[PDB]
Write a protein that binds this ligand. Structure first.
Ligand code: ADP
Ligand code: MG
Lengths: 96, 96, 48, 97, 202, 146, 96, 49, 88
């Protein structure tokens, strides 16, 4: 318990919704970036009935797979936006 | 550092030399400082700059787009001058 | 190669001498005492 | 400074000030302007909407009754924290599952 | 369709063969009308009127003259001569021409809408009265023509009859981006529902 | 003479044009070559422009929306003069205002963005919290000791 | 060489330098036939007139928000109907 | 206008053709560049002509 | 019919003369028209009705119940229920 500690700023950062300038930027940038790799997700799967996993990645240049990257981007911006709307709604209803 | 292994790539800095001049040290000469030579200018502008500005235009015709451009004349004609101007307005890389 | 071949005049017509003298005016306002046109006549072989 | 602040609404029409400081509306705005200059308040004057909307205050005098008005004012928003603290706890079934 | 026919027709003005094909005078006139249907007033002048293989013939029949007079006067924002030139275009382009006597009604609806669309993005809370005297039309016809397109929402505009004021409430804002985004995301959803459910049964 | 004169404009404060015109004419016409030269007599006209220009900058902070009808009293200039002297200041790029020509309202405030306005709320909420933390250990301190 | 259009050139030039549409409007009416007399003179003088009106218009409306068009026509020095028809044409392009 | 302005220079041998025809030829370049929005090139031709 | 037109006429009018409400909801006395007004909790003060007054009190009735709070669905609730489906 001593080694770990409990932070007094753990409670302040919970109850602070970050600046909104950085949030217009966050949504804007993220949604735009997923258009470039969304297109390449089609080209991967034009065929998929071909044998060998490495083979699929060598024909259409699916190296560091567009399925895995695009999904990953979808899960990680999604985690942040749910938490941000949560923090914002908590502060406004709580404080006054 | 503690044990070599590959973790990141960097921009190229070596084995290809430096012989570039940037856009941050670009000539102060422009097409506006160009006085005379206005007939021939149009053909240079079309030869260097237009493939950049409208690539689609070449494709449409299906014309193999221009290549080398000899500029020539006796000395003091202004050749070095003209090509100083090309370097600012191309908005692209420059090797002299 | 080698598609576009650009020729320059270097003797220059009066039309092209005038333009490079005209660069002076663009660059900076000049005196009514000045006459550019005097310079175009006397030339015979003069590049930029 | 006393009349707007003592209320829980922070934005107040010029009229109420006018009978209070026994001055017409023209001097109300001048009083307000003088304070901002002096660095006693920071805020705005609107003679369009006829409002003074203050947003920074320099410390008030101590008195028992001022204490009482601060203590009552926290009550209002203490309720909201406590009621919300039950809602959020209960909710979530994947809090560490 | 007229939308695509603008492209096609102007590019056949460049290179044409008249052997086993309609007169040239016809293509030139058709080309103008198609311009109206597809393009906004701003790009009317750049892409159809300034085309140099429409200004080599100039005008050489009644039908090209009536249509040419209209196109320019609509961009020029003289609506005084516009309503008179509509009468001319009915006469010489729609009725003689076989292919346009079949969109004899569609033309009327279209070109009243098109005029009304140019003022109403460039004006807010203007009289009916002011608009009639400019147009050269009666007031009574004008009230009735605007109300064709209000219910379909191609003006998105509403008219005070009480004081003759013609109001403007056009979307173009944040709400406008919201309506486009939801019409797409509603269609995506319906598709995901049917297709998902299908794969799941089999 | 110098002391009173200067402090008025150093500090941000409203000081009417007729008070300057009357008071400071006999004080400063004595010294020559700024107000008592013959070429500098007509620098009293340029005293008028500066006081009111000052008046408009102070008012810019302090108001955010004002009627034009009020503003004529604040500067003591007439309606026609008020509108005109604001419009030049927008060209010299000292202020931004929107000026309504029918003698309506004059707003010295800025077009804003959604984001910017909520940045202030981001700060009020943080600082409020900051206070709740400091308060919490000061209360304990006075509890035990007193 | 001396023509009525040599007289036009000096009138128009001085007018455009002033930024005065009043001097311009008068000059266009009295020297209307000199513009009809040549295509090149005619095309450019009207593109010069339209732009002169535009340029001077932005300054009046530079504060923005409820500016009378009676106020505008005063400065401009032309009839209300002439100014209003310019006002509609330019809003449509969407340049303010 | 350009296509056959160029064709004029190629089918002539400079401006060594009669001095009158050169006036007319210089005048015609003059119009065309003025429309392209080059007024230094337009002025220079027109002066020569 | 008389009870049905009161419902329609809340949304239509904000206030009416007592002689106008009389004509519309059909009555042969002004004792009937005001009795009908005060059933629908609309003051008859100033000799005008005030339809908006009943609308306020219906809205309060709804806010006291817990059937109106979750129909709205608050933004704290929506995000948290959104979060646990994913992590499930
Ligand atoms: N069209 C022109 N406008 C202005 N100056 C010019 C022009 N042509 C040449 N000059 C002048 O001539 C100078 C020398 O020309 P440069 O381009 O170095 O010539 P070359 O390679 O033909 O020997 C330039 O620096 C410039 O000052
Ligand atoms: Mg060299």
């Amino acid at each position: 318990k001593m080694l770990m500690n409990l932070h007094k700023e753990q409670w302040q950062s919970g109850l602070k919704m970050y600046d909104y300038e950085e949030k217009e930027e966050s949504n804007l940038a993220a949604t735009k970036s997923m258009v470039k790799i969304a297109e390449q997700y089609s080209k991967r799967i034009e065929e998929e009935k071909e044998l060998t996993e490495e083979e699929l990645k060598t024909r259409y240049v699916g190296r560091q797979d567009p399925k895995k990257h695009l999904s990953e981007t979808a899960d990680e911006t999604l985690e942040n936006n749910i938490v941000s709307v949560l923090t914002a709604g908590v502060n406004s209803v709580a404080i006054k | 550092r503690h044990s070599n292994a590959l973790v990141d790539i960097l921009p190229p800095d070596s084995d290809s030399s430096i012989s570039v001049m940037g856009e941050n040290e670009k000539p102060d000469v422009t097409y506006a400082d160009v006085g005379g030579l206005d007939m021939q200018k149009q053909e240079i502008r079309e030869a260097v700059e237009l493939p950049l500005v409208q690539a689609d235009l070449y494709e449409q015709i299906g014309i193999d787009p221009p290549r080398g451009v000899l500029l020539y004349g006796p000395p003091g004609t202004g050749k070095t001058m003209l090509v100083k101007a090309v370097a600012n307005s191309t908005k692209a890389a420059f090797i002299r | 190669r080698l598609d576009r071949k650009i020729e320059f005049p270097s003797l220059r017509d009066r039309r092209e001498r005038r333009l490079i003298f005209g660069t002076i005016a663009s660059k900076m306002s000049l005196a009514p005492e000045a006459d550019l046109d005097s310079l175009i006549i006397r030339n015979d072989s003069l590049s930029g | 400074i006393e009349t707007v602040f003592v209320k829980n609404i922070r934005m107040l029409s010029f009229e109420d000030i006018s009978k209070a400081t026994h001055l017409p509306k023209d001097n109300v705005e001048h009083l307000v302007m003088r304070a901002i200059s002096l660095g006693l308040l920071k805020g705005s004057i609107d003679q369009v909407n006829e409002l003074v909307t203050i947003s920074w205050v320099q410390p008030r005098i101590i008195s028992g009754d001022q204490i009482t008005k601060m203590k009552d004012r926290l009550v209002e928003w203490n309720d909201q924290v406590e009621k919300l603290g039950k809602k959020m706890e209960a909710r979530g079934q994947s809090i560490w599952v | 369709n007229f939308k695509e026919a603008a492209k096609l027709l102007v590019d056949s003005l460049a290179t044409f063969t008249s052997i086993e094909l309609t007169s040239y005078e016809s293509i030139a006139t058709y080309a103008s009308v198609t311009g109206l249907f597809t393009l906004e007033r701003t790009d009317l002048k750049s892409k159809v009127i300034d085309s140099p293989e429409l200004l080599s013939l100039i005008s050489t029949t009644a039908a090209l003259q009536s249509i040419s007079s209209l196109t320019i006067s609509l961009y020029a924002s003289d609506y005084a001569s516009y309503f008179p030139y509509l009468l001319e275009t009915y006469a010489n382009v729609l009725i003689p021409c076989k292919y346009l006597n079949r969109h004899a009604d569609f033309f009327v609806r279209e070109m009243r809408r098109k005029v009304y669309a140019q003022l109403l993005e460039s004006y807010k809370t203007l009289s009916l009265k002011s608009m009639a005297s400019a147009f050269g039309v009666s007031v009574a016809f004008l009230d009735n023509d605007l109300g064709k397109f209000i219910p379909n929402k191609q003006l998105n505009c509403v008219i005070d009859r009480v004081n003759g004021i013609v109001e403007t409430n056009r979307p173009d804002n944040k709400n406008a981006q919201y309506h486009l985004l939801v019409k797409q995301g509603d269609g995506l959803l319906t598709k995901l529902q049917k297709y998902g459910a299908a794969v799941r049964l089999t | 003479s110098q002391e009173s004169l200067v402090k008025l404009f150093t500090t941000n404060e409203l000081m009417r044009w007729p008070i300057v015109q009357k008071t400071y004419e006999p004080v400063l016409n004595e010294d020559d070559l700024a107000f008592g030269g013959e070429a500098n007599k007509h620098h009293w006209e340029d005293l008028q422009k500066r006081v009111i220009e000052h008046n408009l900058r102070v008012i810019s902070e302090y108001y955010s929306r004002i009627t034009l009808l009020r503003l004529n009293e604040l500067l003591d200039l007439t309606e026609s003069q008020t509108e005109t002297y604001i419009s030049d200041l927008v060209n010299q790029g000292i202020i931004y205002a929107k000026v309504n020509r029918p003698a309506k309202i004059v707003n010295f405030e800025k077009p804003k963005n959604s984001s910017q306005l909520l940045n202030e709320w981001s700060h009020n909420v943080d600082e409020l919290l900051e206070h709740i933390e400091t308060i919490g250990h000061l209360i304990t301190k006075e509890e035990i000791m007193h | 060489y001396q023509s009525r259009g040599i007289d036009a050139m000096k009138a128009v030039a001085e007018a455009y330098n002033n930024r005065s549409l009043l001097d311009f409007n008068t000059a266009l009416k009295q020297y209307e036939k000199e513009l009809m007399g040549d295509e090149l003179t005619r095309s450019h003088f009207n593109a010069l007139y339209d732009t002169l009106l535009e340029s001077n218009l932005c300054k009046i409306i530079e504060p923005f928000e409820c500016v009378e068009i009676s106020h505008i026509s005063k400065i401009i020095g032309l009839d209300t109907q002439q100014v209003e028809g310019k006002l509609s044409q330019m809003i449509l392009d969407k340049i303010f | 206008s350009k296509a056959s302005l160029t064709a004029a220079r190629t089918a002539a041998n400079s401006i060594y053709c009669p001095t009158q025809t050169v006036a007319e030829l210089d005048l015609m370049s003059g119009i065309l560049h003025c429309e392209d929005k080059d007024y230094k090139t337009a002025f220079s031709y027109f002066f020569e002509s | 019919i008389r009870d049905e037109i009161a419902k329609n006429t809340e949304l239509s009018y904000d206030f009416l003369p007592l002689s106008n409400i009389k004509a519309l909801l059909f009555f042969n006395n002004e004792k009937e028209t005001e009795k009908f007004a005060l059933e629908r909790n609309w003051p008859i003060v100033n000799s005008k009705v005030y339809f908006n007054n009943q609308s306020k009190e219906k809205a309060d009735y709804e806010d006291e119940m817990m059937h109106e709070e979750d129909q709205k669905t608050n933004i704290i609730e929506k995000a948290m229920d959104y979060a646990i489906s994913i992590e499930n």
